[PDB]
């Protein structure tokens, strides 16, 4: 059929995973989205002239790391590592998410993008420099987003597709 990318949105509770997903899919900001609901949504896009379908998995719920769940996560082709720029713990968590993804994929070369969300807030506690430097050490792109204003949303997901398209 037509080209498909499975993109998995990860990161701590409350960082804006669901809001980023729904902004990408239907261009509206959701204020309240149940943190236990993990759903996927598919969107037709055109990225660098190539039509494709993005299958976006908005991860949620309990943090349980089992063989079956690992194998399910392994079906993701690229991962958005999302933290919130006003939540230092969510940034500290990022390496844990990354290491679990590498483990399940049996690869140190998995397509990923680091996303600092909630850029519209007055309350930053994570410096852009620190997140850029982390992403550089990982060899992956860094995007800042606001699911509220939509700034950076398409850049984050389309950058992740472009990372997948490099992947050997
Ligand atoms: C407040 C709820 C919420 O938004 N979230 C909890 C946090 N994660 C949800 C998804 N999750 C798991 O399902 C644990 N299993 C698991 C996850 C991964 C990832 C790191 C998500 C890719 C992998 Cl690779 C394997 C397995 O088994 C973690 C916590 C978001
Ligand atoms: N100001 C602001 N609030 C946001 C943004 N993204 C998410 N939120 C709010 O942050 C809370 C958590 O968002 P949610 O999408 O549920 O995060 P998730 O737990 O990672 O799925 C909600 O009240 C959202 O409306 C953002 O970019 N800016
Ligand atoms: Mg959610």
Swiss-Prot record:
Phenotype upon changing residue 118 to N: In colorectal cancer samples; somatic mutation
Entry keyword annotation includes Calcium: no
The reaction(s) annotated as catalysed by this protein in its Swiss-Prot or TrEMBL entry are: GTP + H2O = GDP + phosphate + H(+)
N-acetylmethionine modification sites? 2
Q: Which InterPro entries match?
A: P-loop_NTPase, Small_GTP-bd, Small_GTPase, Small_GTPase_Ras-type
Q: Which GO terms describe its cellular component?
A: cytoplasm; cytoplasmic side of plasma membrane; cytosol; endoplasmic reticulum membrane; focal adhesion; Golgi membrane; membrane; mitochondrial outer membrane
Q: Which GO terms describe its biological process?
A: actin cytoskeleton organization; cardiac muscle cell proliferation; cytokine-mediated signaling pathway; epithelial tube branching involved in lung morphogenesis; female pregnancy; forebrain astrocyte development; gene expression; glial cell proliferation
A GO term for molecular function: G protein activity
Q: What is this protein called?
A: GTPase KRas
Provide the organism lineage as a comma list.
Eukaryota, Metazoa, Chordata, Craniata, Vertebrata
This protein's gene is called: KRAS
């Amino acid at each position: 059929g037509m080209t498909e990318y499975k993109l998995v949105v990860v990161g701590a509770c409350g960082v804006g995973k669901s809001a980023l997903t729904i902004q990408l899919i239907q261009n509206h900001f959701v204020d309240e989205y149940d943190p236990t609901i993990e759903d996927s949504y598919r969107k037709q896009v055109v990225i660098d002239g190539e039509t494709s379908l993005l299958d976006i998995l908005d991860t949620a719920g309990q943090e349980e790391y089992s063989a079956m769940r690992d194998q399910y996560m392994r079906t993701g082709e690229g991962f958005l590592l999302v933290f919130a720029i006003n939540n230092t713990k969510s940034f500290e968590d990022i390496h844990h998410y990354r290491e679990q993804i590498k483990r399940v994929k049996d690869s140190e070369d998995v397509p990923m993008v680091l996303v600092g969300n909630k850029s519209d807030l007055p309350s930053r506690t994570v410096d852009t420099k620190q997140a850029q430097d982390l992403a550089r050490s990982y060899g992956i792109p860094f995007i800042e987003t606001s699911a509220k204003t939509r700034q950076g949303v398409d850049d984050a997901f389309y950058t992740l597709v472009r990372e997948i398209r490099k992947h050997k």
